Design a binder for these strands. Structure first.
Ligand SMILES: [Zn+2]
Ligand SMILES: [Zn+2]
Ligand SMILES: [Zn+2]
Ligand SMILES: [Zn+2]
Lengths: 74, 73
DNA sequence: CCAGAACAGAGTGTTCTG
DNA sequence: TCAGAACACTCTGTTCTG
């Protein structure tokens, strides 16, 4: 059974280039195209799992990017 | 004017014993009375300010309590 | 002035569709 | 196969009332 490379939850398939859960899929699209105040309250090392993924959108987006998510050819 | 001792925002008065903004007032009553599953994603030192106070309710609650907030006062 | 109620929003996560 | 739309919810924050 397949696991999200970002938050560890159960993954539906490959989204924006990366094996991810549905919530990480849509969070990534929204973060890149949106305007948000995202600032880590930590050390930019926050644990991102299902229970805590809402805690630090800044670390979550970082994980999306470092995993290689992208919206396609520029 | 005066600053919230929890998140640093603009303080609306003395709530539950501590100089506090309005958001932190109701966050605290909800946190102490209800049931949540707050879990720190960090090292339990998270920065609590207006920009980030939503990030870590657990660190926020610890900070409210360390400041001396209580539903009795 | 302050506590609690009432009211409203941000951000999130799911179901549905082709 | 995966991307997008759009509703429903959770926690949150502000205005209102006593
Ligand atoms: Zn995920
Ligand atoms: Zn973080
Ligand atoms: Zn505050
Ligand atoms: Zn924390």
């Amino acid at each position: 059974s397949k696991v999200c490379l970002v938050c560890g939850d159960e993954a539906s398939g490959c989204h924006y280039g990366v094996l991810t859960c549905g919530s990480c899929k849509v969070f990534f699209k929204r973060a890149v195209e949106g305007q948000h105040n995202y600032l880590c309250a930590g050390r930019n090392d926050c644990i991102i799992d299902k229970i805590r993924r809402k805690n630090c959108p800044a670390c979550r987006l970082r994980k999306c990017l470092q995993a290689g998510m992208n919206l396609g050819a520029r």
